[PDB]
Amino acid sequence: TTIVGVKFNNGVVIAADTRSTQGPIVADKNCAKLHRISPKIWCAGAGTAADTEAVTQLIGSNIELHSLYTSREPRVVSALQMLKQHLFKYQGHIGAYLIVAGVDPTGSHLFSIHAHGSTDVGYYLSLGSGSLAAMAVLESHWKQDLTKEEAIKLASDAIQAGIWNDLGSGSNVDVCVMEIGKDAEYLRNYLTPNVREEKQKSYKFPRGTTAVLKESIVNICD
Amino acid sequence: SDPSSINGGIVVAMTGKDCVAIACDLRLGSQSLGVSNKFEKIFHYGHVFLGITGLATDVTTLNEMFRYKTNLYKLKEERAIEPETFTQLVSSSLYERRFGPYFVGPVVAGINSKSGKPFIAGFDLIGCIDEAKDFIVSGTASDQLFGMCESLYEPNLEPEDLFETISQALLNAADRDALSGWGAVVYIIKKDEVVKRYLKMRQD
């Protein structure tokens, strides 16, 4: 898994691969690693697939409420404290490694959370078995004051780093952008560089090939 | 010792043109010992199907669990549960036991009565939803199944055809797995109708 986050002049963006695996076997060739916490607070996750979705929804929920109760848009530092204390509560057993970013009345924000519950903040970050590849790229092409379009390429490149040079990551690239005054855009399948070449032959078996013994109908409606 | 590997079993489901299919083998054994050759692993609640491979006691329990949960849903909502939804139910129901899981690998297949687009999904033992628009597999012969499917599959297959495909996938992947086989069943599904056929296979 490869997840990245890069801050830019008036917002933030994050991205991730789409390979989910049970060991050396690809479980989902395009699973979604970006999670909506609140309209303008999104988080990306690597680690145990299920924990990333769970701790993400759980908090997403606890957040949604908190806002209604305060008639205020949510703040990242909140999702962050909420995520971190939960994770730290569970001594590390919730394999969720997350990059959480988004916009709120106080500004733009970017952070990272490790499953043991420690947090970090910076202008660019990455995590996952592809962490190293991308971080490399990130250390190779970043510079302060990046535009929206410059940032995306950056983050896009970095994932591609992961995809190509890490068995644990692959397929497509998911990107989400969050800018200070606009609605947030979820770009699912921004890049699709791994399409299967047409198969060489067709195995449409002539009908009847299979040997059947008994055959019946089933009753659905009551 | 690998709970997921004591009893044995495999299930696979595939999407087609306005249809879905799901199948499984009929074996139930204890390690090397074959025990029952009538352990259907596909259950259905209304028009939503779910198959479960893994530890037999859990397979059973869960099934019973989903009956209960789906029955209450119907009374409370006065309509039969839909796949997209049911799935989320299964997922949440597994994660509830994140630190002492049911050793299984559910797979879901069915169609939205309202929308009509076929649907299938699978999960790991703790909830991760495996959404794929082509095929799902599970069981001791997972590796095998993946193999069979990824090769033989092709989009928009008609009911009479998809049948063959899924059947071969199962049949053949089973034969390469010691712990699975001893019989097989396949469910073909359509908006209004559903058919259940049993297959002829080696009994070794």
């Binding site: 898994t1 390979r19 989910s20 695996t21 049970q22 060991g23 479980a27 989902d28 699973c31 690693k33 996750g45 690597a46 680690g47 145990t48 697939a49 299920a50 990333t52 078995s129 644990g168 | 790991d124 033992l125 703790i126 991760c128 495996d130």
Partner: peptide, 4 residues
Amino acid sequence: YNWX
């Protein structure tokens, strides 16, 4: 479980 899956990784994702």
